[PDB]
Amino acid sequence: MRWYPWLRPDFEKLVASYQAGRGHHALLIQALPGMGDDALIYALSRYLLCQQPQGHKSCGHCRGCQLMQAGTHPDYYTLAPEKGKNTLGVDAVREVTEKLNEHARLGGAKVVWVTDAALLTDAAANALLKTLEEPPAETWFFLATREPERLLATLRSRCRLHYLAPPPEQYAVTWLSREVTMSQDALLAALRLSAGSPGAALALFQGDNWQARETLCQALAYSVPSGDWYSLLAALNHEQAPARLHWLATLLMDALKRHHGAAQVTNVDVPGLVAELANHLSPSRLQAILGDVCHIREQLMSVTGINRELLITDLLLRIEHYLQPGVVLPVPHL
Amino acid sequence: MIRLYPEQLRAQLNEGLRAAYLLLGNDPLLLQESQDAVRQVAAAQGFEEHHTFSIDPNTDWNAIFSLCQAMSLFASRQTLLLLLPENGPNAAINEQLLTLTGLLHDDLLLIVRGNKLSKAQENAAWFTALANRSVQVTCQTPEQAQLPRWVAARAKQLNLELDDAANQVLCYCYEGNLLALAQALERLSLLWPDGKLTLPRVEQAVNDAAHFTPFHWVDALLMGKSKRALHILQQLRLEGSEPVILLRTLQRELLLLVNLKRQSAHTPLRALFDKHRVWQNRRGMMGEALNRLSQTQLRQAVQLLTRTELTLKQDYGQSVWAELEGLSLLLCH
Amino acid sequence: SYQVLARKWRPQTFADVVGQEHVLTALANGLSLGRIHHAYLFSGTRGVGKTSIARLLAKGLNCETGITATPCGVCDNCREIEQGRFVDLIEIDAASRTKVEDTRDLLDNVQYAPARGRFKVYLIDEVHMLSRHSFNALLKTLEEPPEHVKFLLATADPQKLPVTILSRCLQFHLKALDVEQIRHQLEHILNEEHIAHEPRALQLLARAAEGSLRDALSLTDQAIASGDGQVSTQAVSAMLGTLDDDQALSLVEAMVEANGERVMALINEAAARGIEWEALLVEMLGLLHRIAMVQLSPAALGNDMAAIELRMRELARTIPPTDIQLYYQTLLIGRKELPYAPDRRMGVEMTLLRALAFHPRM
Amino acid sequence: QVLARKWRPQTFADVVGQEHVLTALANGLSLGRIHHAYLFSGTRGVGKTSIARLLAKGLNCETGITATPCGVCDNCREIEQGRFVDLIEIDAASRTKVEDTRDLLDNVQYAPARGRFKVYLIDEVHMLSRHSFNALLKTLEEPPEHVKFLLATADPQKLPVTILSRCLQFHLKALDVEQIRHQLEHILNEEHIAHEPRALQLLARAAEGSLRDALSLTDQAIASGDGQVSTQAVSAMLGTLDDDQALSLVEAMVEANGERVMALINEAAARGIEWEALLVEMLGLLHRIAMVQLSPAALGNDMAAIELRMRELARTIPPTDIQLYYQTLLIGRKELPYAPDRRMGVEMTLLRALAFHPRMPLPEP
Amino acid sequence: VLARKWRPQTFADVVGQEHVLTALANGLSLGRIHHAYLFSGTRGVGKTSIARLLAKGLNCETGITATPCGVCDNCREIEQGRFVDLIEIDAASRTKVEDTRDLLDNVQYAPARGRFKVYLIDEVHMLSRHSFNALLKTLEEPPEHVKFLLATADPQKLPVTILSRCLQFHLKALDVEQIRHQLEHILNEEHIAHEPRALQLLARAAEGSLRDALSLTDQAIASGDGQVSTQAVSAMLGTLDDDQALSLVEAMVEANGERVMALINEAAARGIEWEALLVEMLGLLHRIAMVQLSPAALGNDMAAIELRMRELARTIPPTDIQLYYQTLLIGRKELPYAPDRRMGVEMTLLRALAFHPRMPLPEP
DNA sequence: CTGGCCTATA
DNA sequence: TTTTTATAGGCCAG
Ligand SMILES: Nc1ncnc2c1ncn2[C@@H]1O[C@H](COP(=O)(O)OP(=O)(O)O)[C@@H](O)[C@H]1O
Ligand SMILES: Nc1ncnc2c1ncn2[C@@H]1O[C@H](COP(=O)(O)OP(=O)(O)O)[C@@H](O)[C@H]1O
Ligand SMILES: Nc1ncnc2c1ncn2[C@@H]1O[C@H](COP(=O)(O)OP(=O)(O)O)[C@@H](O)[C@H]1O
Ligand code: BEF
Ligand code: BEF
Ligand code: BEF
Ligand SMILES: [Mg+2]
Ligand SMILES: [Mg+2]
Ligand SMILES: [Mg+2]
Ligand SMILES: [Zn+2]
Ligand SMILES: [Zn+2]
Ligand SMILES: [Zn+2]
Ligand SMILES: [Zn+2]
């Protein structure tokens, strides 16, 4: 969990309110992945739990800070998911909501960090509602998401919103150039793939990840001219599919942008693949395929347990059908 | 080690008893029947004390040290039974067994029930040094091919006279559930002392109760026999099979079909099967399929199997069984 | 002893409640007539007075002064309810205590008479989460409680309750609070709190409340931290994501002119200014609506548009009504499906791109 | 106090509808042919619990097993107050487990304390675990002479077939607009409460077949209208608007005249009427119209004041056209959540109507 | 009660089931008694009735016989309810192991009246794993004076390790005539008036169960005030119709709009959940479209609905069938938005009707 | 009253 | 060679 420089002022504004004792008991921070909301919170958590605060700072030498420092501090609850899983269940919430009525087991404040509100089960969300509207005293909640609009209506209105806007593109690229050594064009794409978030950007270069985009790009460079899109299975069928599908989505879109002669593309670093999409596919089909590729991505992410291989396979067999002349293409609904 | 089919057992247990009787297989009736044929003849050779013992990996190193002790001379002859885990003899139990292999008396008679064994499980020292001493009984069930003979065989041992056509009708109704086929004859001989089981006579005394695995279904699809399929579905329902399982087993195959069908333009049929490690007995069946089904039908099958996966796990839908009845028909044109 | 506005200002007497005047009336009305039911159910969207009112009805039943519709708030009994400490208002977090075993306990302790109050009032909130079995356990008792017992159910999502449960209740559907309703209330509060505000920023806040007082109060408390102490127009608008009127129209224009290169290039400067995408889409839906309207009668364009009106009327004259509906339609669906696409930006891009390639008919 | 509870019929005479159930029972008590497992089913509020209790009351009446219990003998009055030591009203939804059912069984053998019969009435019986169902099986097929089972439930399909085959099933039907109305009147009269005759038609309808839903609705009508059940009160509470203004906008729409459509919306707007509400009454009308086309007598009994005009519309407009207006007004609904502004959305929906109007489209450039 | 009174006390008295009875007869007759019988089949087709006869014929004072006498002390004693050596366990209320262990501790002591100790375990599917294990031990080593008659409607639940120790007799469902005849018999003996077709309607409604039949009659006899009339029975069965969805498919294809909108009204009384009617219809349409690809697509399941279905299949155009289908699915997609769920289903059929290919809707 | 096991609903 | 998941209700042996 790292701390990024673009947090300083967001932190300094949020602590302030707390420092006055007028902090809001239920802050929902919205940040892209990799924007460092987890560290922004930690900072806020640590400050709330330290018994000898040096202004904004946590001292390190008080009992509180020590315990916090060593995993175990009785009054800090983390609500992430069970290790094997990707939802955050109701039973897990209910422990935290109960123990919260016990006087602070070290007579301080109690802080609850909900790592990603998106992961609250529908049942977990509601269970959180009454405690969240009116917690005991000196209780402090922190939740985070990508997208507040995906969050239970009633949960949303008990929180105060704080927006973690990402730094200017320029700043972020200069940030990056100092962490990885890649082409300028590269950074820029990685960054743009990542909706602006440096570090979410940076994370692309760290994994097996960028090596795998190059593989998607290679494969794609073949399917386009030839019409073999089932050929993509191998580069897409992988646990990281939602991400790689999103990569493919942005390529289709960049091509659609060139059919319109737009200045920004996203995949700045592969303007050759972008052009070949523009050349061998009609607007009508670039667009339709963009449609389906996103729509599956959603399902792949939002349907518990759904079979990746079957879904990606059907998507590829079906794209090939769209390629045929005169087939009827998909048009969003409702 | 004298390998046997349950029918043959009765005779080679009369010749000579042997220190070890290995009952291996899957079929619930061939096991019970064999089991009992042995216990019966053991009492009758002086055996009073009979002990049973199910071996989980749960049996401690104190539960297997109360079995090795369970055989000391001279006690009136005792019949020690052992039951087996799903996996068979693990590395922990592969060794406990080794301890029993040399403790063999005319006083202690070993009986062992369970599934078939992995080939290097069978070839694990203790088992082959039991080998010239032991008898082994194949209890696998007969399949849609091998089955009628087993019926016309049992039919005769119960001295009943079955017709070509009545045989056909028992095999349809009771496939994969011998224990019901067996009572089927028992019930028919009480019905008619004649012993003559004309078709129409046997017809009236039957009920439909086959047991299939999801594999049976995909096979019927692969070979384009639709009426068979639909029967399999209807029975798979009433046994309450998780339909999720059906989806996934149809898919391993339907996706493989997609992928063969494509490449089959470029590389010969045979090289492809090799490429993919396609079990030999499956291979003729597969080609049949690849021949009847277009590269489009396959695609429609894939789209339609996908709609029913979503319909199941996203929409929490009822449809599923009927969506599969229909998928099943599509793959048979 | 600080607490968020959203919490402090919970109406503590009927007199202090905003709107919902049809509920407040039948409640006060029945309390007075003597026609007091045993199972009131309270519904509506988040933050419009559901459980604030339940709690008010409970003070009203138990008040030391008498069963009233206008409860004092100055007897041991109203104070205790205010603070949650009152023994004979049993408040259940249904969303937490959903299990039958739990609600069967509830029942086993109904037969017993009230401690210090006149009625034993069960307030089951977020009631839509009780299990199926829990709902049915209540069936017999909810229909036929002891004379000393009253049930007050509240939920945001009443669709989810079995129809057998509804049959047995009086259902009061609280309306969403009106834009002005929310606004006057915002004014009052910021005044009593002694905080500086600018009229037009209350305007933006009420709109953005999207019908809900709590929502509204939470936005306000966000204004007050973001704003350094003031709730100014400048501040709220930066925070909310509000648009300067030109940028929206320019996009509508480039959109109908099938001008790809410009729609994208124009979204890109929007991206840089940090615009709230759902706002864009909405403002855009709004202009398309004017336009289609004017085409009906020329006088339907507002005084409010003056600086735009030249560009509006053109779009009205040029573009066929039919083709404007497809534009509206397409951006509406696009807003709906917005939070599902991989970025918010990418969603606006797929949406406008789709719309772009309409222009020529045949 | 509370209507829904006060008016529970206390004799068969007092029960509304359900002739087919009432007749059968009565025909059978005097006929001396009396089952041991009666099962009562049908939607909420149609009289199953109250019939069940009436049967019990009739089975034990000190005068004799009779279809017309006397409502005065100790047993009758006692059953009415719910404190009769031989009518065991079992709340199946709390006693759901087997170990519970087993206790009920253990005490079946024992003979009644005061009456001809020990009557178990097992209400909301569909909640019993699978286990406790089968536990009932044998005792339900072959009880003792002095035992009777009255099962009642909202949904019977939940009951194992093995249970059903064992009992007489009386499925009470939901109630006619007219049947409910008559009752709502009787009660309001007897209870001395001023009412407008139409407020009753309006409630009887909103009741959606349920007599309880009806009374519950009336109760809060009495409260909303302050001691009076008035049409203004009722349609306020129901979100109906009084029927002219809805229809008038439909007509304006089919007649393609925009000015009036928009005007009628501006007028809807000063009243503040609820936007989804309006869209709904309109589909609500567009339907009855498509309906009346099909079968003529099908036009409702509630809209006498509007029929002249409705009839006219069914006459003059092609079904294919009407399915269009409904379609269009429907997705309008689907869209309303997402439209910028709930009004704007309703406005825009009708504009779509005019732009795609079949008989006089909006003017192309 | 009819269901109780007319319980066969003699083998002759039993309806159908001839393939069980005959084997039982001959086994008693020819000295072949298994140590354990299991009787299965659906609700009310003779499962336990036959169990209780095997007991009479097993202990008759005349001897072991196919033709028990029903008059000896032992035979009226069992007919009655209290025969010292017929232990009829209600295995559903006594399922725990404690209870089964205690039953079986007395298995060893001899029978104090007749030839055999007969344990008659009914609705036996309910016993625990552990109560089965315990039962098994005694069925593997049956005492001689002991026999075990096991009955359950759902045998699929007994362990394979028990099914393998009982001769299992699967009772058949009774045929419409088989049921009709017994109806006529009984109704006459009780001296009760009936029209030929009232009985044909009852038997059909019973769905193959002789109990569901007698239960349906007792009630019939009430609605008729002592007479079983077609006027009357037809009435009562319409009270109880599952019908509504299959019926609307038939009445939709035939363009009969009064019958279509009256069925929609019939549905409202029975008190339907509307999105559910729709779904039974889409689901019927599907099932039919497949009995167009093969006959085998109609289930073991379908029987009472069945005759109707095969005819619906023959007499329809399969391009038409996917036509209706598109319209119903859309009505569904539309139904939460339609103003009244009822109105929704109505306008969905009204749409189905005006866009009828075969006989369209009249235009002004 | 725990831990093993089964089931139904969404 | 045989499989979605989160929450719930429930039965049983010892
Ligand atoms: N009608 C209203 N009048 C005044 N304040 C209100 C009203 N509705 C909501 N609020 C504000 O919203 C906060 C939460 O309200 P609450 O009554 O819990 O809404 P809910 O219906 O969602 O339970 C209250 O504390 C109060 O500040
Ligand atoms: N047939 C009916 N006749 C008169 N009142 C009825 C009838 N059905 C329902 N009610 C009214 O609704 C109340 C609740 O009825 P109840 O019989 O409990 O319905 P349920 O069938 O759902 O148990 C009754 O007390 C009565 O006032
Ligand atoms: N074959 C049959 N002959 C005559 N009556 C029957 C027959 N089957 C069922 N019945 C009727 O149903 C009643 C109960 O039958 P039963 O044998 O207990 O059904 P189950 O198989 O469900 O235990 C009997 O009293 C009898 O009246
Ligand atoms: F937040 Be409220 F109870 F909808
Ligand atoms: F109100 Be009823 F018993 F469903
Ligand atoms: F007694 Be049966 F199985 F209904
Ligand atoms: Mg609330
Ligand atoms: Mg009731
Ligand atoms: Mg039985
Ligand atoms: Zn510190
Ligand atoms: Zn007071
Ligand atoms: Zn009386
Ligand atoms: Zn006799």
PDB file of C-alpha atoms in Angstrom, chain A residues 159-284:
ATOM      1  CA  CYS A 159     -22.236   9.095   3.416  1.00  0.00           C
ATOM      2  CA  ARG A 160     -20.366  12.241   2.594  1.00  0.00           C
ATOM      3  CA  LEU A 161     -18.668  12.080  -0.713  1.00  0.00           C
ATOM      4  CA  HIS A 162     -15.007  12.891  -1.304  1.00  0.00           C
ATOM      5  CA  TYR A 163     -13.628  12.761  -4.858  1.00  0.00           C
ATOM      6  CA  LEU A 164     -10.041  11.710  -5.426  1.00  0.00           C
ATOM      7  CA  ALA A 165      -9.439  13.371  -8.772  1.00  0.00           C
ATOM      8  CA  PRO A 166      -6.249  12.181 -10.592  1.00  0.00           C
ATOM      9  CA  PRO A 167      -3.420  14.594 -11.344  1.00  0.00           C
ATOM     10  CA  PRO A 168      -3.112  16.270 -14.759  1.00  0.00           C
ATOM     11  CA  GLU A 169      -1.914  13.870 -17.496  1.00  0.00           C
ATOM     12  CA  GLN A 170       1.314  15.768 -17.808  1.00  0.00           C
ATOM     13  CA  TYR A 171       2.130  15.416 -14.122  1.00  0.00           C
ATOM     14  CA  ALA A 172       1.333  11.730 -14.220  1.00  0.00           C
ATOM     15  CA  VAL A 173       3.593  11.035 -17.126  1.00  0.00           C
ATOM     16  CA  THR A 174       6.439  12.841 -15.478  1.00  0.00           C
ATOM     17  CA  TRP A 175       5.637  10.849 -12.320  1.00  0.00           C
ATOM     18  CA  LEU A 176       5.832   7.624 -14.352  1.00  0.00           C
ATOM     19  CA  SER A 177       9.016   8.394 -16.290  1.00  0.00           C
ATOM     20  CA  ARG A 178      10.720   8.261 -12.918  1.00  0.00           C
ATOM     21  CA  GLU A 179       9.303   4.833 -11.926  1.00  0.00           C
ATOM     22  CA  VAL A 180       9.622   2.831 -15.136  1.00  0.00           C
ATOM     23  CA  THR A 181      11.660   3.262 -18.256  1.00  0.00           C
ATOM     24  CA  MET A 182       9.303   2.969 -21.224  1.00  0.00           C
ATOM     25  CA  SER A 183       8.664   5.084 -24.271  1.00  0.00           C
ATOM     26  CA  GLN A 184       6.852   8.333 -23.751  1.00  0.00           C
ATOM     27  CA  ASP A 185       4.138   6.997 -26.073  1.00  0.00           C
ATOM     28  CA  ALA A 186       3.935   3.902 -23.837  1.00  0.00           C
ATOM     29  CA  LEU A 187       3.387   5.702 -20.526  1.00  0.00           C
ATOM     30  CA  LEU A 188       0.778   7.884 -22.091  1.00  0.00           C
ATOM     31  CA  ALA A 189      -1.171   4.853 -23.251  1.00  0.00           C
ATOM     32  CA  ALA A 190      -0.814   2.934 -20.039  1.00  0.00           C
ATOM     33  CA  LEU A 191      -2.007   6.045 -18.271  1.00  0.00           C
ATOM     34  CA  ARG A 192      -4.922   6.478 -20.601  1.00  0.00           C
ATOM     35  CA  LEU A 193      -5.903   2.873 -20.420  1.00  0.00           C
ATOM     36  CA  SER A 194      -6.110   3.487 -16.674  1.00  0.00           C
ATOM     37  CA  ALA A 195      -8.465   6.453 -16.837  1.00  0.00           C
ATOM     38  CA  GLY A 196      -5.848   8.851 -15.648  1.00  0.00           C
ATOM     39  CA  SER A 197      -4.663   7.023 -12.552  1.00  0.00           C
ATOM     40  CA  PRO A 198      -0.861   6.942 -12.327  1.00  0.00           C
ATOM     41  CA  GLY A 199       0.211   3.856 -10.545  1.00  0.00           C
ATOM     42  CA  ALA A 200      -2.866   2.022 -11.740  1.00  0.00           C
ATOM     43  CA  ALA A 201      -0.883   2.933 -14.864  1.00  0.00           C
ATOM     44  CA  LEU A 202       2.372   2.025 -13.215  1.00  0.00           C
ATOM     45  CA  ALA A 203       0.819  -1.335 -12.201  1.00  0.00           C
ATOM     46  CA  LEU A 204       0.482  -2.320 -15.935  1.00  0.00           C
ATOM     47  CA  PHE A 205       4.225  -2.243 -16.312  1.00  0.00           C
ATOM     48  CA  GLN A 206       4.861  -4.244 -13.221  1.00  0.00           C
ATOM     49  CA  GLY A 207       2.962  -7.412 -13.867  1.00  0.00           C
ATOM     50  CA  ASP A 208       2.986 -10.003 -16.587  1.00  0.00           C
ATOM     51  CA  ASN A 209       0.478  -7.468 -17.779  1.00  0.00           C
ATOM     52  CA  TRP A 210       2.090  -5.308 -20.412  1.00  0.00           C
ATOM     53  CA  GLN A 211       3.701  -8.406 -21.920  1.00  0.00           C
ATOM     54  CA  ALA A 212       0.118  -9.683 -22.383  1.00  0.00           C
ATOM     55  CA  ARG A 213      -1.203  -6.557 -24.024  1.00  0.00           C
ATOM     56  CA  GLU A 214       1.525  -6.965 -26.608  1.00  0.00           C
ATOM     57  CA  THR A 215       0.191 -10.497 -27.092  1.00  0.00           C
ATOM     58  CA  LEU A 216      -3.388  -9.282 -27.553  1.00  0.00           C
ATOM     59  CA  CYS A 217      -2.077  -6.741 -29.962  1.00  0.00           C
ATOM     60  CA  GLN A 218      -0.115  -9.351 -31.890  1.00  0.00           C
ATOM     61  CA  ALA A 219      -3.090 -11.671 -32.119  1.00  0.00           C
ATOM     62  CA  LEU A 220      -5.413  -8.838 -33.058  1.00  0.00           C
ATOM     63  CA  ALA A 221      -3.104  -7.718 -35.785  1.00  0.00           C
ATOM     64  CA  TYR A 222      -3.867 -11.151 -37.308  1.00  0.00           C
ATOM     65  CA  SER A 223      -7.535 -11.598 -36.697  1.00  0.00           C
ATOM     66  CA  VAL A 224      -8.460  -8.283 -38.246  1.00  0.00           C
ATOM     67  CA  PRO A 225      -7.203  -8.834 -41.809  1.00  0.00           C
ATOM     68  CA  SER A 226      -8.106 -12.512 -41.810  1.00  0.00           C
ATOM     69  CA  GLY A 227     -11.466 -12.504 -40.050  1.00  0.00           C
ATOM     70  CA  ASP A 228     -10.325 -15.066 -37.513  1.00  0.00           C
ATOM     71  CA  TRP A 229     -11.527 -13.649 -34.246  1.00  0.00           C
ATOM     72  CA  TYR A 230     -12.056 -17.007 -32.514  1.00  0.00           C
ATOM     73  CA  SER A 231      -8.243 -16.919 -32.693  1.00  0.00           C
ATOM     74  CA  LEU A 232      -8.375 -14.304 -29.899  1.00  0.00           C
ATOM     75  CA  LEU A 233      -9.550 -16.882 -27.303  1.00  0.00           C
ATOM     76  CA  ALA A 234      -6.087 -17.685 -26.198  1.00  0.00           C
ATOM     77  CA  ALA A 235      -5.105 -14.055 -25.445  1.00  0.00           C
ATOM     78  CA  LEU A 236      -8.424 -13.273 -23.760  1.00  0.00           C
ATOM     79  CA  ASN A 237      -9.282 -16.443 -21.930  1.00  0.00           C
ATOM     80  CA  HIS A 238      -7.521 -15.857 -18.682  1.00  0.00           C
ATOM     81  CA  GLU A 239      -8.565 -14.730 -15.281  1.00  0.00           C
ATOM     82  CA  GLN A 240      -7.595 -11.190 -16.154  1.00  0.00           C
ATOM     83  CA  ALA A 241     -10.225 -11.173 -18.974  1.00  0.00           C
ATOM     84  CA  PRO A 242     -12.230  -8.202 -17.798  1.00  0.00           C
ATOM     85  CA  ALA A 243      -9.129  -6.096 -18.115  1.00  0.00           C
ATOM     86  CA  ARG A 244      -7.925  -7.470 -21.414  1.00  0.00           C
ATOM     87  CA  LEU A 245     -11.438  -7.171 -22.876  1.00  0.00           C
ATOM     88  CA  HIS A 246     -11.273  -3.501 -21.827  1.00  0.00           C
ATOM     89  CA  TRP A 247      -7.976  -3.236 -23.694  1.00  0.00           C
ATOM     90  CA  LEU A 248      -9.713  -4.619 -26.789  1.00  0.00           C
ATOM     91  CA  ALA A 249     -12.597  -2.249 -26.199  1.00  0.00           C
ATOM     92  CA  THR A 250     -10.301   0.754 -26.328  1.00  0.00           C
ATOM     93  CA  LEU A 251      -8.682  -0.382 -29.532  1.00  0.00           C
ATOM     94  CA  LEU A 252     -12.064  -0.663 -31.250  1.00  0.00           C
ATOM     95  CA  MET A 253     -12.912   2.707 -29.977  1.00  0.00           C
ATOM     96  CA  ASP A 254      -9.721   4.338 -31.205  1.00  0.00           C
ATOM     97  CA  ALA A 255     -10.484   3.044 -34.651  1.00  0.00           C
ATOM     98  CA  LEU A 256     -13.944   4.487 -34.381  1.00  0.00           C
ATOM     99  CA  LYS A 257     -12.324   7.737 -33.455  1.00  0.00           C
ATOM    100  CA  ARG A 258     -10.163   7.794 -36.499  1.00  0.00           C
ATOM    101  CA  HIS A 259     -13.217   7.173 -38.729  1.00  0.00           C
ATOM    102  CA  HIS A 260     -14.124  10.552 -37.323  1.00  0.00           C
ATOM    103  CA  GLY A 261     -10.614  12.021 -37.420  1.00  0.00           C
ATOM    104  CA  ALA A 262     -10.367  12.691 -33.699  1.00  0.00           C
ATOM    105  CA  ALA A 263      -7.132  14.018 -32.130  1.00  0.00           C
ATOM    106  CA  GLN A 264      -6.863  11.942 -28.914  1.00  0.00           C
ATOM    107  CA  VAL A 265      -6.677   8.220 -29.174  1.00  0.00           C
ATOM    108  CA  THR A 266      -6.164   6.009 -26.158  1.00  0.00           C
ATOM    109  CA  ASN A 267      -3.687   3.444 -27.471  1.00  0.00           C
ATOM    110  CA  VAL A 268      -1.205   6.103 -28.441  1.00  0.00           C
ATOM    111  CA  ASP A 269       1.561   3.555 -28.633  1.00  0.00           C
ATOM    112  CA  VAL A 270       0.105   1.240 -31.289  1.00  0.00           C
ATOM    113  CA  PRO A 271      -1.167   3.578 -34.028  1.00  0.00           C
ATOM    114  CA  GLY A 272      -0.560   0.867 -36.576  1.00  0.00           C
ATOM    115  CA  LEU A 273      -3.044  -1.565 -35.028  1.00  0.00           C
ATOM    116  CA  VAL A 274      -5.509   1.282 -34.683  1.00  0.00           C
ATOM    117  CA  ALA A 275      -5.215   2.138 -38.343  1.00  0.00           C
ATOM    118  CA  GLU A 276      -5.670  -1.450 -39.426  1.00  0.00           C
ATOM    119  CA  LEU A 277      -8.893  -1.656 -37.514  1.00  0.00           C
ATOM    120  CA  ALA A 278     -10.081   1.515 -39.213  1.00  0.00           C
ATOM    121  CA  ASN A 279      -9.243   0.079 -42.580  1.00  0.00           C
ATOM    122  CA  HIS A 280     -10.695  -3.386 -42.466  1.00  0.00           C
ATOM    123  CA  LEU A 281     -13.899  -2.761 -40.519  1.00  0.00           C
ATOM    124  CA  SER A 282     -16.880  -0.546 -41.204  1.00  0.00           C
ATOM    125  CA  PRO A 283     -17.883   1.987 -38.628  1.00  0.00           C
ATOM    126  CA  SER A 284     -21.107  -0.078 -38.277  1.00  0.00           C
TER     127      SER A 284
END
